[PDB]
Swiss-Prot record, chain C:
This is DNA-directed RNA polymerase subunit beta. The lineage of its organism: Bacteria, Pseudomonadati, Pseudomonadota, Gammaproteobacteria, Enterobacterales. PANTHER family: DNA-DIRECTED RNA POLYMERASE I SUBUNIT 2 (PTHR20856). GO terms for molecular function: DNA binding; DNA-directed RNA polymerase activity; ribonucleoside binding. Belongs to the RNA polymerase beta chain family. DNA-dependent RNA polymerase catalyzes the transcription of DNA into RNA using the four ribonucleoside triphosphates as substrates. It comes from the Bacteria. PROSITE patterns: RNA_POL_BETA. It is an enzyme of class 2 (transferase). It catalyses: RNA(n) + a ribonucleoside 5'-triphosphate = RNA(n+1) + diphosphate. It comes from Escherichia coli O157:H7. Keywords: Acetylation, DNA-directed RNA polymerase, Nucleotidyltransferase, Transcription, Transferase. GO terms for cellular component: DNA-directed RNA polymerase complex.
Amino acid sequence: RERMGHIELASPTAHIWFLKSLPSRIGLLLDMPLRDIERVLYFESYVVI
Amino acid sequence: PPDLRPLVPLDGGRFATSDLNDLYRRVINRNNRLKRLLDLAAPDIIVRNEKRMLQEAVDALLDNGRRGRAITGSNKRPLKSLADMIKGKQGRFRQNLLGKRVDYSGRSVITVGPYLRLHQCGLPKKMALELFKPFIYGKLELRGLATTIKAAKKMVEREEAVVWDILDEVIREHPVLLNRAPTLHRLGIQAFEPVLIEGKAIQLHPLVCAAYNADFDGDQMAVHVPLTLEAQLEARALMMSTNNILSPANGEPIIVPSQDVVLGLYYMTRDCVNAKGEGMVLTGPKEAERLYRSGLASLHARVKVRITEYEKDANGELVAKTSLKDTTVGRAILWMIVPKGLPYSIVNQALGKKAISKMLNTCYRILGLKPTVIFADQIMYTGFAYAARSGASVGIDDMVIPEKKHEIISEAEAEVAEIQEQFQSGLVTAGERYNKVIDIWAAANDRVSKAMMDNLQTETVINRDGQEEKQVSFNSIYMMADSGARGSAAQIRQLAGMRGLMAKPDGSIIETPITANFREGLNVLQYFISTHGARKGLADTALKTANSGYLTRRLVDVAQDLVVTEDDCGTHEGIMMTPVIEGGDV
Amino acid sequence: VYSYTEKKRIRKDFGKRPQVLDVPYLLSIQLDSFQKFIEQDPEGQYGLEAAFRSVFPIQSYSGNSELQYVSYRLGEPVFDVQECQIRGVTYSAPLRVKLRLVIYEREAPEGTVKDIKEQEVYMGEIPLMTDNGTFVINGTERVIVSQLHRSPGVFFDSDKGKTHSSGKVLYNARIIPYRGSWLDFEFDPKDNLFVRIDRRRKLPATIILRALNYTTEQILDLFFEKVIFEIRDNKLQMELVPERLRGETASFDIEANGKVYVEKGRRITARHIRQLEKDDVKLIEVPVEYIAGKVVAKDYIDESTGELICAANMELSLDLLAKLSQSGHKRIETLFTNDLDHGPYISETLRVDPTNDRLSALVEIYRMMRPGEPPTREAAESLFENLFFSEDRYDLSAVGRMKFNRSLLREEIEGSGILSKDDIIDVMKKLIDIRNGKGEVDDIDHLGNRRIRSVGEMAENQFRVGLVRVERAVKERLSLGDLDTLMPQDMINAKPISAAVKEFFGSSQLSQFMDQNNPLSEITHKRRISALGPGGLTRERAGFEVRDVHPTHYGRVCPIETPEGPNIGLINSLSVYAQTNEYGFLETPYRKVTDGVVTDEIHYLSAIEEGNYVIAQANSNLDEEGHFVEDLVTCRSKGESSLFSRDQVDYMDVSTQQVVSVGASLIPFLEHDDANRALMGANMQRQAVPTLRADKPLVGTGMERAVAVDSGVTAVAKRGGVVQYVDASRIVIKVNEDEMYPGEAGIDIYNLTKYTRSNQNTCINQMPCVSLGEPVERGDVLADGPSTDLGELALGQNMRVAFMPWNGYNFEDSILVSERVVQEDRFTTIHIQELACVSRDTKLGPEEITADIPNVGEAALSKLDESGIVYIGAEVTGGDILVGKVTPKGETQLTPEEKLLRAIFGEKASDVKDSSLRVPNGVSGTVIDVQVFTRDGVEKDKRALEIEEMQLKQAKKDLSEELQILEAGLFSRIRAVLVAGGVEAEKLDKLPRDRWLELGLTDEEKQNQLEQLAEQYDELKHEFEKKLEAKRRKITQGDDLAPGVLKIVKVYLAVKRRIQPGDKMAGRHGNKGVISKINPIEDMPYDENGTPVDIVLNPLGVPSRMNIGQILETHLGMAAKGIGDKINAMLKQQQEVAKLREFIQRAYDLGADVRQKVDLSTFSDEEVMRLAENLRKGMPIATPVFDGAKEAEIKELLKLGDLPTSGQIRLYDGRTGEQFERPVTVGYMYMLKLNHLVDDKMHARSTGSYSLVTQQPLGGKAQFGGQRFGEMEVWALEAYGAAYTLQEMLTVKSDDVNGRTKMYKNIVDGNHQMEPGMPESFNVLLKEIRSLGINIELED
DNA sequence: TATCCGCTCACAATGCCACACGCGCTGCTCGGCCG
DNA sequence: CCGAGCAGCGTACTTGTGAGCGGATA
Ligand SMILES: [Mg+2]
Ligand SMILES: [Zn+2]
């Protein structure tokens, strides 16, 4: 009941609550609107770093 | 962990599955396909679609909320994820920490117990045996009867005679916790000493129900046990019924007597002008009770009696003075219940609801609380006894109809007829016609109600060394209404006299009242208008209980964030209290 | 004349108004609805022919292949209703439809089709209702409540108050079809009109109008008027009409024809209008500032350059006026604007429209319809014409068109089921007028706008919902199926037709099992009107305006009957005389009142026709020959009571009961109690439970003779005759010769139902009420069903009741009952619980019902039979094995030799798991019946063989009675045949002819008649044998149970529950309560004669809860007993029949001007004795709901006996033995035991099982579960102290799995100390939050 | 460019109890598979 | 046997309140 496990993801995935919390935290942390973040995450556009 | 998503093998082809496991399987499938795809050097579009599917599965299992797309069988709402399992009315923060199920409890209907004291309540035999199994087990292990726990279980299931005294021992001073289904304030949960009663229902003290607002139309109350020395002593100290007499909102006692006892005491105190034993003399309350039990004198008769009243001085002294009063036999008999603290003028009245309420208030303020509970218990006992011995009963002839009621109705009809004639002639309009008929009908209703009221407080005459002497009406319905037991003035007014004006679907007043009363046959359209007006009033309660519950919820949400911890701060700021004299006088 | 059931015990009635229309069939609503469903209806009307002529035929994608329809027929019921309830199958019938497939070759626009295939196919089965209007789906008998929704058509709502917080009234016109998409024209706080479809985005109506082949010019000339501004030589003249200038002040000099009329600043009044009209003037002198404020209607393109200069919907300016004057356009068409006559709403709506042509309008509207997917003008117009102009997504039925035409002042009443452009034009005109002030808004709380739908309509709707799917399937199948493929059999499919109808009848918010606990409950459950469900308002999102009752519900909807709780006013009961209209409305019978006489003719008025006429009152005092006793009478013109004369009256009420429902009409003295108490009693009288011996109600309402008969609980005589064979289980009726069938007739056999389980676990049983030789009439009652007495509804029991406080045992609502009631077996009922155990087909071997249960005591096995099922009539108290269910767990292929050896020698059966079902703990009772059903192919056990042999023997007894009757008839015939040879007959045919039909002499006629009779005999024998074999094959065939099961075993436990302190009982006037305790007879009060009162109530609850009628009832009850008492004093002491007849006549001839007027001289002086025997226990008195008896009638009835006039008798205390002063009233009251007895409420749990997902105790009584500690209880605890108490109640006793064990161990040895520990659920949330990215960590 | 206003979206609605009944994108086809 | 594509078609609006995102005119 208390012991847990872990899934090793080969691709790191960002949390959903930091995107659709209205407002989002990453949206205010990156100074970027939620639309650009959603279009980048869902594999439609790129963004420089 | 798998325990929080259990998969028990259900009987038959049907299986008890958890939905989170489907999302887990989906995300594991997508993760495995991603791990296998990136090793064969797949091009960009396939691995990108795979990563997109993995991210979609992740953001779906974390929370199942979309714009308008929801996958589910027939509930018209999608499957609950862990986030949805945390939120909602059925979520963790509302279903598994706020309200939880507790064991060692019971639920049964309530029944009136008039013999039990205020500090105790009834409890069924089977419920008592079920709610105290380990106490009986431990007491049997303490004695040389039950060797093992299985032996004690076989004994208590065998239902022999040597287990009943053990129950009486373990329920001698072990208070239980009674609870009403809706708990508006703290009084919805109290503590009571249980007494074994034979049957299958929970016997409750009659007076304490007012604290729960629990009628006896089939209310199902719950019962719990402390099961802890600390909890037992707490229930005996604070949550006990005797320790809670004053309402948390107002300093007025929640121990106000009910309708039966106040009716009995009003009958015992209401005196006529001529009866058996009129104008005689007695030497004390005990001799008066003996004279009443022998039947030589009536219950109520103006008799000069001698009593001894105790008055409290500035210190804790109680000076006794013997005085000859001129009161009725009922008050002198009831004086045996009043302790020495209260004076005699507190009972030299008709003892209405407010009268006995202020009597209990003064008794608690003067003598404290220790004798106040016994005083109230004896009040209820004597009230029930003398109400049973009286024989109060409402009949079809007890409600007198005014003689000139028909004449008043005819006058109002002639007035409305001439008003309608003036309206048809073109002198007055329709709005002024309505405004002039409403007040006419209101005045007629007021006149007929005053006539009925003065006709109810009369007709009770009897020869008292003379020919005719008017006195307080001994009528049953008047004794029930004027005493404030159950009926009010408006209720008896609309019952005996005309009901008056009614409402309309818009909410305003219809220009035609109900010229009939309950004692007479109501026309079908009159009853239709009345039930139309009453259905709204009935539905308000059902549509308001949930709003009041939600309001109480919000109020306790904003509240319960503080406790008193400091004795004094050393400030001087405050508010300037003044009586509210705005509008009217005060 | 009086029926024979009335001659057995005639009920004394009251009232002075004689009824004119008899009480109709109580179940006529659902019966008529179902009869209008399954029947050959021409012209494709309601039922099934609508779905056959509105859907069929079907054509492929121009494939020249059509599927026609000819007719449909209902198959015979595959099972009897009794066998249906037994086996749990659906009481349904097949649907054999003769379809016609016509297919032709390609390249034929209208080529003559060939190879017609007319084939009958079976497409699904339809459930049928019995003669009681109940559908037996799966064992239980469910019903369909008639829903109440909004009638299809238009409505004009007035939104105000909290609408946009603007304080401006808004008018919205909602067009709602019968089946399709909605439409709504709405307004804003501004002057802008908009349109919307199914609560979509707000769009102007100009674009949705232009999409229907319209232009701006047509818009303005259809909506607005025409204003003419001409370009004369000068002054820009303009045509004047004296009616338009009303309300507007003259901004210039109103003068013309060289005669001044109005100055500048003076309004034109009606007298000025007449003065200007008497001159007949049109043209005046108007300045430029007047036209410079108007707006040009149409586009005025130039002719010199060919370019538009002044576009539409543009106010005229200096440049525009100069251009229109210099171009050469003299005629100027402008629109009119006046906020009091025609408010500007088309100009602004046109100028806000972004589109200008029909094409782009469709594109924008489609972009609104579905986001994205822009069509190249292909899907836009098609979707727009399919959502509102196609019969595929718009099924506005005849009632919709009727409401549409009636609302718009249209003279016609019919039309098409499709919308139209001019209809939208008219409804928008009506909205504009209702905004300007012309008209009134249509309220939604009016029965004229609220239409009811019965079971037939929703059944047809679900049939169509399945038929559209079968049509899609058959179209996708025929879309490529060429000529000569197959017969039209596999082209159709059973699913989802059967699936849809089964899910509709079984699983819906309205298809519900009916409460089989009271005949009155049954009558009031079928005559129910619901507003929830499909197309209904939810109970959690409703307003206070729908819960209230409208004055239009007079005689149509009962206002005093509604369930108390969340759904108040939403669930109503139908009136007694109420009927459904053709369109679906509610009509009420009335009497047509002529100028002088009130003709006794019935007219069914509708809700819309209410305000048209005026209705007289029911209890209006009238003289003979139809004349009112007073000129000034009370009536109602238009939903409002008033006073009219004896000439303005046009219609009269039919009876005084048409307002009250059938449920509340059984409450006597209903005109003497408040609406609240009567409403509470109406919901309680429905929840009555029948006792062992039902007692007739003394204070009846006359309706008891109907509810008991109109229901399906009483065996009604279909054909009158003489009762030949009486039996506690069956009744045989010999049909009289007058109504007997002229060929191949016999006798009727009514098989009563014994103690069987009902839907509420209430013992339902039928008992006979006639004996041998007693002649019965057609329609008369034959056997009393549950809660009935001699063809009369007997819900509860009458008892002696007093009204006095008794030591507080009647404190607030509690009742005190004497021990006499529990001693006399009065309020004891029977509860029949059904326990079912199924032998599912599991892996590792199937499950068995063997009896060799291992690891169990022999005393536990002693109750089972040789098969493994307990015997019939065995008592069980605690959890005991009553079925031998075992489940294999280990090795399979158990050899039969070793299998039987295990029961003799060696080891036991290990692979069992002891899965045998037992009764729950606490519940007791005696098993009375067993029910077993097997899967097809599985061999039955011996108990199934026994029960099928029992039912086969019952059928054998019935068929043998029939056979012996017919055989005795045929042998009397053969005696009459060979009677010519009488000597040989009497000598060698007395004893042996019953088996020696073989005879012959004088062949010429004797042989012919003998061979004909032998033919008849052999044919009769063969037919009886065939019927017997069919019955046996029907009762012996296996039944499908479930996928993966062997057999199901059902048992019935019938426990007799008596009255005890804790049960809930109530009268019939809302005086409910709980029984306080049982007192002995010596402790209860008693009169001076020595008769102790059985029940004493609280006389304090009468004044506040104003129900005085019951008191009246009580008094009346006393009077009744008095008569009975006298009858007893006339029966115990042997008295001549003359004195008895005289007394009965004096009783029935009470001076109250009653319409009864019975005569005792017409009786046979023998039935009078039976009647007096039936009256010795009381005199059943009937009183109307509003024509009831006055006080003087009860006074004189009491005077008839030796009872006191006041009704109050001095009572002596049982305990002390003294006299109670203030004489208490005492009488007879009819009371009921509610279905809330204590035996299903009291429950307690010390330690039981815990839930698997959370370590918390269980809940409920069926399982061993404790109560729940609510959050408000936590608040109450926090209000007090009790930190340790709350920690114990919440953590150790509830959640801590390691704490409750330690606490139990500390309690079982005397250690009162707990440990807080850590809550598992707290740790559960701790884990989940830790598992989430938002983790946590405990600190020091 | 600000700022009152309108359009769009998210969140609420049993507070408790008892009893009873019952399942709405999967079906079909083509790349990859360790006790 | 498992995972990805192929396919006909497959997947709350009642009223009230608070918050965010434009949005149109000075
Ligand atoms: Mg209650
Ligand atoms: Zn302070």
